[PDB]
């Protein structure tokens, strides 16, 4: 089912409610900061009457002065709060920003005209509660809302005015760890001598670092270790014998709180078992809290006194602070050096007063504040993640508001006006902006770096910066790569090729007739240089783009006709003309089949396929059409052989019986089906009697008997070679097309399609075998078997199949088998737990980033994740900016494609011994699975009811 289906429920009108509709939504809503203190009954009530709003950037929900009609909670995005001190909304200024989890609008409780104009700052998702529903929830649950709502509706301060440093989970965490140490490395805690004085039962920093690195795979560096221990030290569960505020990887003594009492009792066998079961989850917990605890520690160093390392640690965390999201990478790297960290102990502290001089911009790291405006009162309340006082960075105007802390122990980041402006200027000092008609036409940063422009202008910069020195030959290929790769986005060949023809013949704009003699020569050599790097990118794909080939043809002429010649440059061009003259000259697609043991070969759109298209009566006609055939072309080929009347539709149908009518303009539909998906052609008349085939149902009997006689390392090995074949069949540009929309470029992504499909194919392979293994003793053997298969995959640096398997073993159908997991040897409970941790999405799948980075090609990446990166970057950044191609976006997406190149820049071939029989190869490459979840789930409930 859809990850986010709760939204579909918020759609369903209130009166048409369903218990599950509420169960689902509630499961989602419970995770909002403005619902935390909410009694379950309240949250349900909200679920029953709560509307959903998906607003676009720049929408105003209401203006200062209007009558308010709803109360809101932000699920995603952010909004600006603007207030005017006059009767003109043009004078309104932004005082603060509200992000996820924050709520506003409660002034409707007593019918007070809106204090402020609120505007979405970006695409936002809100929960909307109509006045009458809210007045009702408030009278009923007022006591549960006093902490959330601004006065007079709730209390002002929720701080000390009607507890120590340790918290519950961290006090716990410190206990687990001390128990593991005492158990695993007793020597680590003991009396230690240093200059006559002896420090009782304590540890050494470097040593705790050493140990944490040994005990778990989620820790990749001593620096990361430091952050993780600093979690316990700031919280005071692990203390430096001399009370330093920060943990250090040094020869310094620290003591566990438990060892603070002379007679600290040894661990009980129960505690050790209890610890042994929690160590992994404790470590994962600390890995997630560790980055920001480290940022805070380093940040306590004055801006001027921060080292390169300090700044990196700070920089890395900023990337995960919403408030800083819209800032550039450069400004963020600049901020690391000026950001001040500021904390306050007591609620009620006045951070600043309305009317005072505007000094700083604040971002709330911990706690909350009240926004106060004289005359109006508390206008809104802000929480962690929100920011305020940004007016101070615009002009020299006075505070339009007062900020008082709403609770004790608030943390903020603070940027002072002075530093903020230096950064803004220094950013122009490293900028270079060529203006044409009195506006930017090209922008760049000192190495230089293109940022934006038009296709024509961006093209000349790349031609113009080319270096024809054979020494910079590689360095030149480098700079041109982003352009040759991404150009299809903002400048297709239909516009590029002609533009290159022009540049080649164009007459030099400066110089003597003789000087120009030379100029035109270089320009020509440069244009040829770019064409070559251009042909290199497309490579084999050239023979799909009729234009591109036509161009080269006429372009090879121009290069020849020259009386004098570019000796050491031309030869390469004819090579391409001949190869496009040769391999293009053939009457073989080659005809491809799909319904032994082939070594995968790249599939091309122009390649013809023999494909089965089924009919209502489950008969089928085999048509022979190009891979890139359109739906219309397919219908025509079918309607012809069958003589089928007017009105045939083509329909995708998955094992689930689900049916999608395909559009006539759709291309390459063969590779975009589900694992067991089939393709049908029938009359729209009898669209309803269309039913899946018996074969799509999936296998009925397991296959455990077969591959249990196969070693985990042989299956893995054979899975990896196969994976490599699929992986290497993917042209780097297929990634580009996919990210931007295959339908656009009218080219295929068949190879990428098959490879991504392969991922899903593997994970359903796991869920299938498990669910088709009725015996309880023989499933436990599979978990061991799949876990070992994964292990060998990761060992082979095939992260692709590794994650596929792990995601299979995480499938609800497999996860719910409580009885089956519990009887698994603790050894494999450990491996698997470590496996899930690499799939942690926190900080943008950092766990995975670090794991892969610490490896050397050949390597198969976690490809679906890698696809999301591109999709993400695409949607979170505009291609065009004021009618100018956003080239930094281009580069960011090229970043990913290039990472693929690197991953497959070394051949794959481990120890000679795989030799291995073709039997395991056959199995691995001929998987037959159940891809119907509803099915797999039902089975799961027929092996272990509940």
Numbering used by the authors: 10 to 171, 178 to 462, 480 to 627, 639 to 957, 960 to 991
Give the article text.
Exchange proteins directly activated by cAMP (EPACs) are an important family of signaling molecules serving as the intracellular sensors for the prototypic second messenger. The two mammalian EPAC isoforms, EPAC1 and EPAC2, share extensive sequence and structural homology, which includes a conserved C-terminal catalytic core that consists of a RAS exchange (REM) domain, a RAS association (RA) domain, and a CDC25-homology guanine nucleotide exchange factor (GEF) domain. When the intracellular concentration of cAMP rises, it binds to the cAMP binding domain (CBD) of EPAC and induces conformational changes, in the hinge and switchboard (SB), that lead to activation of EPAC by exposing the C-terminal catalytic core, which interacts with and activates down-stream effectors, Rap1 or Rap2 partially through residues in the Helical Hairpin (HP).
A phenylalanine to glycine substitution at this position leads to a constitutively active EPAC2-F435G capable of activating down-stream effector Rap1 in the absence of cAMP with 60% of the WT EPAC activity under saturating level of cAMP. First of all, even though EPAC2-F435G is active in solution without cAMP, the apo-EPAC2-F435G crystal structure still represents the compact, inactive apo form of EPAC2, trapped by the crystal lattice, which is incompatible with the extended, active conformation. The structure of EPAC2-F435G shares the tertiary and secondary structure of apo-EPAC2. The domain-by-domain Cα-RMSDs between the two structures approach a resolution limited low value of 0.3 Å, while the overall Cα-RMSD reaches up to 1.2 Å. Second, while structural changes immediately adjacent to the site of mutation between WT and EPAC2-F435G are relatively small, major structural deviations occur at distal sites, particularly at the C-terminal catalytic lobe, suggesting global allosteric effects of the mutation. Gross structural changes due to the F435G mutation are observed for several loops, followed by moderate shifts in the CBD-A, REM and RA domains. The F435G mutant is intermediate between the apo-WT and holo structures, but more similar to the holo-conformation. Overall, the N-terminal regulatory region of the F435G mutant is more dynamic, particularly at the N-terminus (residues 23–30), the CBD-A/DEP linker (residue 169), and the hinge/switchboard region (residues 439–462). Last, while almost all the sites with major changes in B-factor show significant RMSD alterations from the previous crystal structures, one region, the hinge/switchboard (residues 439–462) stands out: it showed the largest increases in B-factors but exhibited little structural perturbation.
